[PDB]
Amino acid sequence: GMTEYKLVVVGAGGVGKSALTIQLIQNHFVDEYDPTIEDSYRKQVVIDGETCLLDILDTAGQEEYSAMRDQYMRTGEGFLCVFAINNTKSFEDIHQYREQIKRVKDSDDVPMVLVGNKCDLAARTVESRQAQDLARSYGIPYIETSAKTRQGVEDAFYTLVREIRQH
Amino acid sequence: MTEYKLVVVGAGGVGKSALTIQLIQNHFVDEYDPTIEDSYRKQVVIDGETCLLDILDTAGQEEASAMRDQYMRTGEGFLCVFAINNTKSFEDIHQYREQIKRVKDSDDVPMVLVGNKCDLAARTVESRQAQDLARSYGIPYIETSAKTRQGVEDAFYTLVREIRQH
Amino acid sequence: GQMRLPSADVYRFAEPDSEENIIFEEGIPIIKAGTVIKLIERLTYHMYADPNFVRTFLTTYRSFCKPQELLSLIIERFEIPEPEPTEADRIAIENGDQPLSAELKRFRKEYIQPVQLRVLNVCRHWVEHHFYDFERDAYLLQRMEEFIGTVRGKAMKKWVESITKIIQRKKIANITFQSSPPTVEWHISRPGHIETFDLLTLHPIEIARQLTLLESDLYRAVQPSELVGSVWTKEDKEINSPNLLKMIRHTTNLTLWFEKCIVETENLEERVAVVSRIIEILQVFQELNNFNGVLEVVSAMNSSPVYRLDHTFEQIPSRQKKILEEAHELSEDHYKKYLAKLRSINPPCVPFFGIYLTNILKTEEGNPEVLKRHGKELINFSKRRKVAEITGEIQQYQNQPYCLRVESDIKRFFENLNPMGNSMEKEFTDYLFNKSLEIEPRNPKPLPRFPKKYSYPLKSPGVRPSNPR
Numbered sequence: 001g002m003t004e005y006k007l008v009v010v011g012a013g014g015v016g017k018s019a020l021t022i023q024l025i026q027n028h029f030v031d032e033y034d035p036t037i038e039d040s041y042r043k044q045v046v047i048d049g050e051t052c053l054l055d056i057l058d059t060a061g062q063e064e065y066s067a068m069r070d071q072y073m074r075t076g077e078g079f080l081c082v083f084a085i086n087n088t089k090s091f092e093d094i095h096q097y098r099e100q101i102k103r104v105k106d107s108d109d110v111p112m113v114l115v116g117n118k119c120d121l122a123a124r125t126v127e128s129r130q131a132q133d134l135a136r137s138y139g140i141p142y143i144e145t146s147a148k149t150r151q152g153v154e155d156a157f158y159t160l161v162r163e164i165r166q167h
Numbered sequence: 168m169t170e171y172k173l174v175v176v177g178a179g180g181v182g183k184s185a186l187t188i189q190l191i192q193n194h195f196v197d198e199y200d201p202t203i204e205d206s207y208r209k210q211v212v213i214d215g216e217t218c219l220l221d222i223l224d225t226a227g228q229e230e231a232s233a234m235r236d237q238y239m240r241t242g243e244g245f246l247c248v249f250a251i252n253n254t255k256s257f258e259d260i261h262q263y264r265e266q267i268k269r270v271k272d273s274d275d276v277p278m279v280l281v282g283n284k285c286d287l288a289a290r291t292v293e294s295r296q297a298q299d300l301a302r303s304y305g306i307p308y309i310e311t312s313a314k315t316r317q318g319v320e321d322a323f324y325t326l327v328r329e330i331r332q333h
Numbered sequence: 334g335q336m337r338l339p340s341a342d343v344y345r346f347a348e349p350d351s352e353e354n355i356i357f358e359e360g361i362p363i364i365k366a367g368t369v370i371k372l373i374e375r376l377t378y379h380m381y382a383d384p385n386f387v388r389t390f391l392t393t394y395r396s397f398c399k400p401q402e403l404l405s406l407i408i409e410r411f412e413i414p415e416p417e418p419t420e421a422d423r424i425a426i427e428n429g430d431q432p433l434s435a436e437l438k439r440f441r442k443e444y445i446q447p448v449q450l451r452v453l454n455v456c457r458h459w460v461e462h463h464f465y466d467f468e469r470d471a472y473l474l475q476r477m478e479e480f481i482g483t484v485r486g487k488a489m490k491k492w493v494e495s496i497t498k499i500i501q502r503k504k505i506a507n508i509t510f511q512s513s514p515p516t517v518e519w520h521i522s523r524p525g526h527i528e529t530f531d532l533l534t535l536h537p538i539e540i541a542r543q544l545t546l547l548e549s550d551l552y553r554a555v556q557p558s559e560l561v562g563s564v565w566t567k568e569d570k571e572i573n574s575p576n577l578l579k580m581i582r583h584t585t586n587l588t589l590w591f592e593k594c595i596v597e598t599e600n601l602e603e604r605v606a607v608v609s610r611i612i613e614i615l616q617v618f619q620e621l622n623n624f625n626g627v628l629e630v631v632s633a634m635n636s637s638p639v640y641r642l643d644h645t646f647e648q649i650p651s652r653q654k655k656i657l658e659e660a661h662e663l664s665e666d667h668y669k670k671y672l673a674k675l676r677s678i679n680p681p682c683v684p685f686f687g688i689y690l691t692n693i694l695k696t697e698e699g700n701p702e703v704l705k706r707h708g709k710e711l712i713n714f715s716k717r718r719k720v721a722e723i724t725g726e727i728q729q730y731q732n733q734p735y736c737l738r739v740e741s742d743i744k745r746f747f748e749n750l751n752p753m754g755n756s757m758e759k760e761f762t763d764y765l766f767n768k769s770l771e772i773e774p775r776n777p778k779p780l781p782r783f784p785k786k787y788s789y790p791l792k793s794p795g796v797r798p799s800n801p802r
């Protein structure tokens with residue numbers, strides 16, 4: 001019946017990347033989570049009037065298993081490439097994540113979105129103009145999200161689904 | 168995976184902890200550190216079925232003797248351990264047997280009688296005397312050595328089988 | 334009737350339970366949240382022992398209480414005032430008779446002695462299983478030694494004297510089996526000839542056995558201190574999680590070595606022999622329940638350089654295709670079949686650690702440290718229980734040792750494996766991908782031929798073990 005989209009979250013560790021999927025899949029209005037629960041990473045949603053199922057792979061915490069990235073990325077139809085807006089290194093990592101996705105998927109046009117994540121109150125070091133310019137150079141959308149207020153979270157995932165639908 | 172709550176009871180120094188650590192870690196503990204209460208978990212396939220053993224290792228010292236009801240309520244089967252070179256520990260078995268029956272309000276509690284330290288030559292409790300007691304309880308008797316591993320798996324896994332058939 | 338308690342003014346742990354200080358989950362109660370005072374009261378409760386709470390608490394408490402403060406609180410818990418004589422006791426004393434002291438004796442037997450013994454059990458577990466607090470804070474250790482060494486009175490004496498000795502042993506700080514380990518197997522490389530050791534010259538059975546011993550030892554060395562607080566992801570990860578990182582880096586190095594062995598074998602027939610040998614090693618990993626090793630192989634075969642080698646895949650025997658496919662299926666659907674298989678096998682095993690890491694991290698990140706109730710902030714203990722359920726599972730699989738003999742030279746060979754050399758990661762993985770493109774070019778470029786590189790027989794000895802007398 002309904003379409004299932006396999007989405008993969010990628011990006012540097014240690015800077016709050018996991019908050020994006022947790023806040024999406026969460027009981028939006030109760031701050032609670034058991035990731036061990038069968039289908040704590042599947043969510044039925046309605047995007048532009050069309051019901052679909054999101055299956056989200058977020059291997060947050062496994063970043064040091066660098067030789068597994070190809071295997072994990074291969075499972076995805078669309079990718080959220082996430083950096084922290086107060087961690088310049090995580091932003092500089094984005095280019096290599098995108099190159100690796102293109103290689104694994106053997107395509108120069110893989111559905112993906114760039115996500116700038118605000119994970120704390122430490123001072124921002126990546127300005128939105130820098131990230132917009134990077135996203136434009138790649139031809140992909142840019143979404144900024146808060147790891148605490150859920151702002152931008154739906155927009156990030158729904159924008160990616162639209163990129164898949166319009167591929 | 169079925170979970171089984173096993174409890175190891177008996178007089179101080181008979182080898183309850185050494186038996187448990189041999190089962191869990193394949194290691195013999197030479198030290199005598201009196202237990203207050205310890206708990207262990209073990210995933211193991213027994214008769215083709217995987218289960219999870221929760222093993223409660225209890226205090227044998229008499230100074231803890233007023234604190235037993237709380238663990239006897241939780242346990243589903245009991246290893247009743249004495250040492251075959253310690254006749255007083257054998258005489259203490261019946262006190263544990265009777266307390267378990269009272270707390271669980273049952274004449275039919277899964278139990279195994281264990282005569283530990285069977286690696287030692289200087290035995291003072293004869294196998295026949297222990298076997299007679301076990302028969303009077305309706306339970307098996309297994310001699311063990313936490314030092315050599317003799318009988319250790321047999322004792323614990325026999326108790327699992329008696330919980331499974333209960 | 335229930336025993337009367339000290340006044341909560343002189344003994345803080347006698348305050349009544351209320352929703353302002355403790356919340357239970359919906360036959361002992363399970364705590365959802367509470368003040369630190371209430372958590373310590375229930376950690377050392379007079380009515381029952383809770384050994385899984387002791388482990389949970391001692392594994393996770395540093396997220397809400399400093400080690401120095403925990404020790405102060407359990408010493409405060411230990412120092413319980415005794416009740417004054419009752420009216421009946423008073424009347425006996427006024428007549429020159431000895432009082433019965435029934436209420437005093439009951440309070441000693443049913444409140445003081447169980448609480449004090451359970452405080453000592455916290456101390457014993459703390460020293461035996463969480464000694465890193467004392468390694469990192471010498472003054473904390475001094476305070477613990479002084480507390481234990483000044484407990485008076487005969488009811489606790491056996492455990493006080495024992496704990497003193499345990500501490501002294503921990504400051505300056507053997508396996509028995511049901512059977513003999515199997516005989517070490519040899520192929521082209523013979524014992525002592527380490528210079529010839531390689532993927533195809535060692536026996537594939539013994540490659541899998543020695544990697545399993547190595548990977549089991551790495552798995553067994555990871556302590557919960559390297560996991561709680563998600564510290565392996567933070568800036569001080571090399572300080573706080575060294576055994577975990579060593580384990581992961583071994584896994585990464587072996588995966589990269591498998592990829593390098595494959596793509597640097599340019600002759601197609603030889604490369605098929607290399608991949609077939611790796612799948613045989615995977616078969617033995619499966620037989621040994623070394624799931625880390627299984628996924629090391631699967632990760633290599635799904636890497637960008639190897640996955641695209643269609644001409645190599647075509648020549649792999651059908652039975653080996655099926656072995657690799659069923660290993661790959663363990664990881665599908667968020668490791669559904671892996672998780673079921675891990676929970677069904679008979680240990681020893683070597684779990685894949687990455688799932689535990691993701692679940693600990695997401696449990697930490699996805700649940701609040703405190704719950705706000707009736708204007709009070711209560712520690713969210715349910716969150717810590719969930720983390721300790723994961724660390725408890727990890728520990729359960731760390732207990733069982735493998736009945737396999739170490740071969741010191743083969744062990745050293747795999748310990749010293751360094752496929753990347755002095756190259757950086759991007760450099761090296763680009764090199765592997767360029768080799769893949771060289772040996773099997775993208776269509777419609779023709780497939781070239783390449784010379785053989787191995788001078789010894791490529792035929793595998795197989796992975797069924799042999800047994801001479």
Ligand SMILES: Nc1nc2c(ncn2[C@@H]2O[C@H](COP(=O)(O)OP(=O)(O)NP(=O)(O)O)[C@@H](O)[C@H]2O)c(=O)[nH]1
Binds near residue numbers: 183196200315
């Ligand atoms: N020779 C031999 N010694 C054993 C055996 N089992 C235990 N011991 C020794 O007996 C002593 C007491 O063992 P332990 O396991 O601590 O006994 P326990 O019954 O747990 N004592 P407690 O009730 O105080 O906790 C230790 O020195 C231990 O090495 C055994 O099978 N053989």
Ligand SMILES: Fc1ccc(Cn2c(N3CCNCC3)nc3ccc(Cl)cc32)cc1Cl
Binds near residue numbers: 634643645649
């Ligand atoms: F020699 C090899 C070379 C490449 C592969 C990659 N690969 C394939 N390929 C099928 C043919 N088209 C490319 C994908 N199916 C697989 C199933 C499971 C796993 Cl883990 C890897 C897999 C495997 C071998 Cl055996």
Ligand SMILES: [Mg+2]
Binds near residue numbers: 183185200201
């Ligand atoms: Mg003991």
Ligand code: NA
Binds near residue numbers: 086087088125
């Ligand atoms: Na920065």
